[model samples]
Target chain A: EEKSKDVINFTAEKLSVDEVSQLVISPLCGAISLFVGTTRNNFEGKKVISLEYEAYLPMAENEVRKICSDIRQKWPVKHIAVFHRLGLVPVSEASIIIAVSSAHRAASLEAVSYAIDTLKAKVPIWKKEIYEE
Target chain B: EVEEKSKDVINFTAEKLSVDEVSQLVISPLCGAISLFVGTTRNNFEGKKVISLEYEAYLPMAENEVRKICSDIRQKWPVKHIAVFHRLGLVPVSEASIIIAVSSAHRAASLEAVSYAIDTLKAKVPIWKKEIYE
Candidate 1:
């Protein structure tokens, strides 16, 4: 199978910030922007020990694809990559990463922001916080 | 002399820029959001096919300007860490010319900081870019 221009993955394995960001680099694009969402050690006043995530892979991917489509319509972005981790994510570990590339900084930067915001709003991904008692 | 960890890391080098290294420098447990902006050499510019880009900077002045930018970011946003790395010498098409990364507890701080960092750097920093058109 040919490598797709847009790389989308939902995996239980650890996500590499480098791998996902690298996939969106293009010769025609001068700017690449990324946003990484990590599991915080604490939420509100509670100490978060870890985070567990689950997703309906089919629908999650579809929703993310729609986000990418929206981004393309709104910005002149070159490549897009969205990777979300499933299962347990320890403190400080990345739970999701979104990367985008474009000829200008604003396009990629704005697109990345939109991608993450939309993902959280529409994707069928669920998160559970394990608090320290 | 013991060197304490700095919240901001700035580098200007002839070596290739590593997106991983720069972005990782800002990652922290206290910060859930890590944002990055990478400036690469485009193959074409203006109607010409570009081959590469050459950058030259007055190290002392450029470094100071970048540090100033970092100081401004700290005042404007509660960011945890910042990294600004610029590649000097010949940068071929598809190679990164500069990489700026920032981290914070929330996405907005780092995101806005990164955007501000690049824009301010372009306007204030003494770095000059020469385009080699094919």
Candidate 2:
């Protein structure tokens, strides 16, 4: 069993993947796993224009808080910080950043991987493709 | 085929890692997934205080070991631009000591590569972590 502070949630803005990455760092923790999802130039074998994201800010924040709580309950992770970019995001720009830490590498990675999938599935976020047809 | 898009992915340094620089380095238009693993000095170790970590490595041999992992990742994942970097000398709390950034076509592969890279590095790499308690 581990005892530590619950000190993270989510952010929406012109996000900085670096800032959120640094926030979740813990000294007692040994492992940190970070996931960055950048927009690709193509989706479904078609050239894309760009991608735009929108979120219910207040609701999104609440949803993120829930995700963090759930992740802590499910994994042996020490800390987690998720930053998602909204509005216009061009190809090769990061759309999502999930940074989480644990006492071991496996747990950290597992928590991070789970965060991304869960965020995409549960968070009140939407993506619109500005396609290049 | 192992494409040498960036050979700087695996190396040793005494300077602090700028996650921004490293992130920008491995991020590619071709890949949607980029996972970066940054190891830093935690404030507490063994139920006490950790002031800093004294790091030292036999540069050539230490790098050789990390590079081996990079090669192994290549054979296993269809990834682009990979970097597994470690810092030498003294590291204080909250400062990064090692950073491994790898990109792949999907999210899972990048996370997998980074997880393996850090685990293997910690297990095998000769980089010594001298814990300093204040």
Candidate 3:
């Protein structure tokens, strides 16, 4: 049995959020914390026409890996997965996904939040928003 | 102007809820809390064998109600994502009756919103349940 964790591709398929959650949260993991960044139809009451996402794949992956390694060392985390999508995404489509599992609820929650905050501030990824008049 | 995130909410049916799919939609670094409620049909209800239960709902109203609940939850907490599903028609005992999943940056908000969403849905939503006793 795999005692540790895994890191996977951030794909374009209609991803299943629940499935990804189970993978990170095993029997060893008592608490699981997840964050989903989605596309909403409107922004500031303005209809969202579309959005374009760009990423420096190599750099983003590197940052993600570092974040995972740090989280593991800091907490009793069983698994971690960071998934982010690229290209055009219509309204109400999932753009990014992240899952973290740990032995305790507090640790898992803290670590998961840390990962997303750090990613947004440090990762070389950006999004272009288009609003409809 | 409020900054919007790219996200999607979807619906599906199965013998049970897919825990993995819910986990996948959760984004990290931003989401610090997650709460899930799984309601399963009991084999024996009121000391009677439940042959089956039929669920009826006003589809459009039910969907609108669900969306409204989600929106209300968002106001109380900085929720990242939410999904709610209720099984319709005949459902056997020990099957999933309903599932509500909510994610937020804080556990307090997540739990509160999740609890309120389910409670309000049961009380206010135009969903009817009929029990078939055997």
Candidate 4:
């Protein structure tokens, strides 16, 4: 029961918003909030082509687990799923997706935002930007 | 030039709502943060068991009101794009009745905008909810 409450994954394949959202859906939960972080075409004034994300496998997983634990303490969220894409992510493609469910909107919305912010700051994920020259 | 001025997508449909479609409508190369809220039909409400939910809306009024919400969000925050989709007719248990998505350069704007969109929609939009209980 406890294990199903959180789904954390780091994949090289394309991330599906539908699949991640499905993992957090429950009959008891009426609200599912999501945060999708996508690769932008340009950064600052530079033209960007794509981005690649690399991480130390073990530490990345551990840091995300810590985020989930922190979220559970702060809000009454029912289920949480966090997916980070590895390898090349083109412009307009999602690099990370977070889904949180709750009986009400506030908990999930707040939790989803917290999950993405914490993941970026704490997770040992390295991002390499490929720019168009 | 005119198309670029507004990045808002608002709709009402009898078909099932797709989370990806609604979220994708607001995706832009300039935006990094996309926040969304999905309102689904839960199995229980209060002490009663809910079979499903049915929704009815005055389309002309609802559309205008939703557009006003998008306008309000743009005025209040530095959001890039907005998408609001409300499903009409039957919404079964665990199905989405409404989905609102907002995109921005930062997290806070999109997050706050999405919350405000749903809250404002509930209060202002001419959409009526009929709860079916077992």
Colliding residue pairs in candidate 2: A27-B42, A27-B43, B9-B83, B9-B84
* Full candidate order by lDDT, most accurate first: 4, 1, 2, 3
lDDT, residue A126, candidate 3: 84
Alpha-carbon lDDT, every model: 0.89, 0.80, 0.65, 0.90
On lDDT, who's better, 3 or 4? 4
Better model by DockQ: candidate 1 vs candidate 2: 1
- Candidate 4 residue B63 C-alpha distance from true site, Å: 1.5
DockQ of each: 0.82, 0.65, 0.06, 0.82
lDDT of 4 by residue, A1-133 (tens): 3344889999998888889999999998899999888887777777888999999989999999999999999999999999999999998889999999999988987898788778888999999899976
lDDT of 1 by residue, B1-134 (tens): 22335489999999999988887788787788999889999988998899999999997999999999999999989998999999999999999999999998898898899999999999999988999987
Q: Over the stretch A1-133, how does candidate 1's per-residue lDDT look in tens digits?
A: 2233788998888898889878998888899999889987878877888899998899888898899889999999989999999999999899998999998988998898888778888999998999976
Model 2 clash tally, residue pairs: 4
Instruction: Report the poorest 10 consecutive residues by lDDT, candidate 3 chain A.
Output: A25-34
Alpha carbon deviation, residue B47, candidate 1 (Å): 1.6
Residues B40-131, candidate 2, lDDT per residue (tens digit)? 78778768888999899976889888888888888898777788778888888888888889998788788788878888989888988788
- For residues A1-133, write the lDDT of model 2, one tens digit per residue: 4455444444445557777776777766766788888887778877775789888788988888888888888888887777778787888887888888877667787888778888788888888989854
Q: Candidate 4: which stretches are off by over 4 Å?
A: A1-4, B1-5
Query: What's chain A's TM-score in each predicted model?
Result: 0.94, 0.84, 0.88, 0.94
Question: How far off is residue B88 in model 3, in Å?
Answer: 20
